[PDB]
Design a protein around this nucleic acid. Structure first.
Lengths: 48, 49
RNA sequence: GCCUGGUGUCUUGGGU
DNA sequence: GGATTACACCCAAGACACCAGGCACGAGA
DNA sequence: TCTCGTGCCTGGTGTCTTTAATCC
């Protein structure tokens, strides 16, 4: 939940995200691209 | 005084450490967002560790 | 007409 | 040939993404 | 009035090669 990864405001109206929030975005993006492979253009060496 | 006292001028220097720059007390006060434990530091009304 | 939020991560210099 | 271990507390001052592409506005012909 | 160039803002995405002792 967000209690584990709170947002902080660097200079009042500007907020950056916790390292986990950015890292979960990367896992989530990478998860969608695995779904994007198995249905069309997979040159195998790309799947790996 | 029954004893005599060594007495005379000496050069003394005033150092930066003054008590009203160190004194600190906390009852209740601000907490960290992440741990909900008292904040660190005199300048933030913090609590002792 | 009660409630009332101001950052972090470092680095460096210091105190006992 | 590999990591893990390396006192405690405290104060304070001093800092912050880059590059490329696209769109919009202004100036010149 | 139209076209071209420059500047600003927003979005997406990395890489030329260059401290010391212990046990298990």
């Amino acid at each position: 939940p967000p209690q584990v990864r709170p947002s902080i405001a660097m200079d009042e109206t500007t907020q950056g995200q916790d390292d986990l929030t950015h890292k979960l975005s990367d896992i989530l993006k990478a998860n969608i691209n695995v779904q994007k492979l198995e249905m069309d253009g997979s040159p195998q060496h790309i799947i790996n | 005084l029954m004893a005599q006292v060594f007495f005379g001028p000496t050069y003394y220097q005033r150092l930066r450490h003054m008590v009203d720059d160190k004194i600190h007390a906390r009852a209740r006060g601000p907490v960290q967002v992440l741990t909900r434990q008292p904040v660190e530091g005199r300048s933030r009304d913090g609590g002792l560790r």
